[PDB]
Amino acid sequence: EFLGDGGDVSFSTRGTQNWTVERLLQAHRQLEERGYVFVGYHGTFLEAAQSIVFGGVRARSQDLDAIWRGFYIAGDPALAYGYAQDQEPDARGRIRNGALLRVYVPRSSLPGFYRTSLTLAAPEAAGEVERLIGHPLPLRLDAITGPEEEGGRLETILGWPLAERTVVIPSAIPTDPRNVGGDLDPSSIPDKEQAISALPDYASQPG
Amino acid sequence: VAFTVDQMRSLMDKVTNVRNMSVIAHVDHGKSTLTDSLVQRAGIISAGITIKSTAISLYSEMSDEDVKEIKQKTDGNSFLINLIDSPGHVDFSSEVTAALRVTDGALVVVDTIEGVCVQTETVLRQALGERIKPVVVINKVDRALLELQVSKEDLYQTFARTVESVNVIVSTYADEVLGDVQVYPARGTVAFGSGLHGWAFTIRQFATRYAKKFGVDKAKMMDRLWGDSFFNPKTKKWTNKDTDAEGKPLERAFNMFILDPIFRLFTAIMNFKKDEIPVLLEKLEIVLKGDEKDLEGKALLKVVMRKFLPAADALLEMIVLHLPSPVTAQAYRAEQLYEGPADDANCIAIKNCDPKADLMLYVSKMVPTSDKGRFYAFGRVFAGTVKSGQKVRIQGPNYVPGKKDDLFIKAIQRVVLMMGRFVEPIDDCPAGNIIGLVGIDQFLLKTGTLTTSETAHNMKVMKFSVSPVVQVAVEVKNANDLPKLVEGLKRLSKSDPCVLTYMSESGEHIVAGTGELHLEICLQDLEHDHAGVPLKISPPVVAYRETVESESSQTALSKSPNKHNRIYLKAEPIDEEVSLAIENGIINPRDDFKARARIMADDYGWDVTDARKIWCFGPDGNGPNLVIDQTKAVQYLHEIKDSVVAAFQWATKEGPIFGEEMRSVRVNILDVTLHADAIHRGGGQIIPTMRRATYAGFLLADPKIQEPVFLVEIQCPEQAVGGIYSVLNKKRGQVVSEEQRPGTPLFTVKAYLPVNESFGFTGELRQATGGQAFPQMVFDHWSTLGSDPLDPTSKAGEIVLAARKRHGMKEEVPGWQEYYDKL
C-alpha cells in the first residue's frame, strides 16, 4: 500500500477524507524509497479518483485506432484541476467537485519520458512524437509531454501500458465545492506539497 | 361497543345528542388514565388505512328520567361523545387552540392535593375564551387518603377550596353572554375520583342511591349531600347547623353518606381486617367474583372501588347531562368563529347548526395516514352536510370572498369517521359532527375552511406557517445505522406537513422546523421512532436569506471549462411585493407565461417584455428568484436553457454569502456565446458557468442577508403583562399592538420577534409572567439586515462568519472576482 498510514482514504465533495499534508509527505517519501517518482497531477470525479487509487489506473476498452489514446496528466496542478469535476450533471442538475490525484511511476520507466514544443494535435506532432519514442503511435511503455494547445500549459500522456504501472495517491490540494468551475487558487496548494512536486527532466532527443 | 356505518350516521343525525369535548388536564394528573377509562368503557368500534389518533367516539345511554334533567333540547336516550385529543404540554399553543376551537364542552381535571395548576389554569382561560363550558373532576383522591391520611372533613374542605379556585377562574374569564358557568358539586358538575384505582363519583350519583332511603326527590337529596347540611344520627333529623342542642358537633351530609362509606372500605381493606371487609362489602352490595375474593391490599381495594364507583360513568354522566350539544353551543359560539358578517347567510347557518344550508366545515388539522404519505383533513361540520364525491370550495388562510387567491374548487374524494386510529367511510355527515376528509392534503397545508357559498368568509383561522426558520443537521453515531436514518427522515417528513428533511450540497441531512420546540419534538420522534438510532444532532440554527440591494456594479461574466462558452448577466432586486406575490401564488411558475406577464406588468410594474421572458423561478423552481432572458440574437440559446435553469436552482438554493437561500434576486442574462457544436455546450459546461456568473452577478449587486421574524401573539392577565414587555426588550422584540378583552382583565399583546432571538423564549416568558402568559408565534416576514454581510465585525458579518466557520468554509466571503472569468 502506498497511502501512508492513518485510516481509510475516501473521496468526498467535502474533501478527501483522512488525507492530511503530513500523511502525503509520508506516502511520498515511501514511494521514493521504493524507487517511484512523481510525474504529474490528474484531475477527475470522485468515483474516478476512488477507482484510480484503489484499483489502479486501467485503460478499459479503448479505441484501438485512436493513436493518442492514453492516460492524461499534468505537471501543473492548475491544469489538472480543471478536470476535477463531474463532466455531466446528475439527474437533478448538480455538478460536484472532483479530486486531484498525484501520479507516480516506477522510476525504471523514466527512460521513456520525452518532451516536445509541438502541440500534440498539430499534424507534425504525431510524426515527431513517433520519432522520439522510436515507434509508431499509440504510446506504449512511454510518455510524451507537450503544450495542450499553442501557448497553453503542458500536458503529459502516459501510454496505457505505462499508465497501468503508475501508483496514484490523493493530493493535499483541495477542490472547491463552492466554486466548481473556478480556477485553482495557487494559495490553496500546500507549501509542503509544492516541495515534493518537482517533475523529472524529460528527454527531447530519442534514445 | 361496535357499530355499523348506519348506526353511526343515524346517531350523527341526532346532533342534539352529540357532545364535542376535549379534556383539559396536566399530563401528571392522569389526563391519560382518565381518558382511557372512557375509551375502555364507552369507546366506539366499527362492526386497511390507519391514521394518527386525533379523536375518539364515545357512546352513552341514559334513563328516560335522566334525559329530562338535561336543560337543553335532546331526542332519544342515546348520546355520541367526541373526545377530541389535546396536546401534552402547553407550549403547543397553536394546536391547543385547535382542539378547543372544535369543542363545545371541556372535562377539566384538577388534583386533590395540588388543586388547579398554573398550566391547566391557562388552558381553561383559553377554553373559556372560546366559550367552552367546563365540567370539573378532582382526580388523585387516593393520594389524599393513602398518603396524607386526611380526615373526612379536611378532605371536604380541600375539595371546597379547589372548587372555589376553579370558579374564581371560571367566573373571572367566562363570557358574560354565557350566564353562570361555574361548577357546583351539588349540581352534578363536579366529580371526585381516582384514575389510578379507576373510581369516581358525582353528588348526583350518591343522591340517586340514598334517593328513597330518606323519602326524597334526589333534587333535594343531592342538594344536601354538599355544603352545610347535617343529619343528626340521634334525632334522625336534618339540620342546618353543625351542632345539636347541647353544642355537640354534627358531621356534614357529604362526609356522612359519601366520604364515610369510601373511607371505611379503605380502612377495612388496607388494614387486612378480613372479618370486616366481607361484612362491609355486602352492605354496599359489592360482589367479588372468583379470583377476586382472595385479593388483598391495594390489589383488592382497586377492584372493589372500580365495581363500586366506576370512574368512566361519573364522567360520562357529567358530559351528557351538562356539556352542550353541537346545537346549544354554536348559537353563542358561531359569531365568534366567523370572520364574516354576523347576519351573514352562513353565520346564521352556523348558529342554527343547519344541515340544509351551504357547507361550513372547519379543518382544524391535517392528520397522517397509512395510505401513502397522504394526510386526511380533521375537522367539524358547522353548517350544511359534507358528502363523499361532493365538490367543495377549499378556502385557505389567505382567502377572501373578493379575490380568488388561495381558493381550490375541488371534490371531496371520501368522507370518513375518525374512529381513533382507524377510519370508516361514510356517505355524508350533517352539521354538528367531527369528521375527516380524504383528498385535500394538497390544497390545505394544515388549517382551512370548506364552503359551498361563493360569498362565504373563512372561519376563525388558526395562523401557522410552513416556513422552515430553524434547522439542524442529523448524523448517525454508528455509521452502520446510516440507512436507518435515511429512512426515518423520509418517514419523519411523511408524518408532518410542516417538517422538512433535505440534503445540502455538502451532503448533510437537514431537519428544519417552524420553531425551536416544533423542531425539538421532531428530533426526539426521529431518534426514538422513525429511526431509533443514536443520532448526532447539531445545535439549532436559524434559516436566513441571501439577497441583493441593487443592480450589479457591472456586468458579470463567466466562461465554461471548455472556455468555449460564456454567460454575461446582471443581478438586481425583486420588490418585496413581488417576492410576496411569488410566495403567495399570485405570481405562479405554472401559469401561462402570458397571463402571468400581464399580472406582473399591470399590478407590479414590470415590462411585460421582461415578464414573458421568465426562464424559471428558484429554488425548487418556485422560489422568489427569477432568471429573465434578455439576450438578443444568441443562436442555439434554447439548447442551454435546461442547464441554465438547473444552475439557477443551485445558485438560489445555496448562495455565495454563506450557503443560505437567495430571496428576491433577479437575474438578467444580457448575453451568451456558445460553441457551435452541442458536444461542447453540455450540462457539465454550462451549469458551472451560469452558477458562477450568477454568484458573480449577485456579489456585484450589493449583497445583504435577511433574517426571519415571528409575529407572536400573547394572552396574559393585565397583572403579568409587564413581564412580556420585560422579555421583548431583551430580544429585540417590536410590539405591534396590545388589546384587552372587554369584560375580563385579559390583555392580548402582539409583537415581532427575530427568530434568532426566540431560542428558549417560552422558557423565559414562563418565569417573566409567573407562567400566566400563553405564547403563540408564527413566521411573519423576512427582514433585511442593514449591516454589510462582508464586514466580519458588522452584525450581519458576525452571523456570516460564524456560519461559514460552522460550515467549515473559508472564513472570508468570496470576492466576485473568484466567480467572474479569471482574466
Ligand SMILES: NC(=O)c1csc([C@@H]2O[C@H](COP(=O)(O)CP(=O)(O)OC[C@H]3O[C@@H](n4cnc5c(N)ncnc54)[C@H](O)[C@@H]3O)[C@@H](O)[C@H]2O)n1
Ligand atoms: N484529467 C487530467 O488530469 C488531465 C490533464 S490534461 C487532460 C485532458 O484530457 C483530455 C482527454 O480526455 P478524455 O476524457 O478523452 C481521457 P478519457 O476519455 O480516457 O477519460 C477517462 C476518465 O476515466 C476516469 N477513470 C475512472 N476510473 C479509472 C481508472 N481506473 N483508470 C483510469 N481512468 C479512470 C479517468 O480519471 C478519466 O476521468 C486530453 O486531451 C487532455 O487535454 N486531462
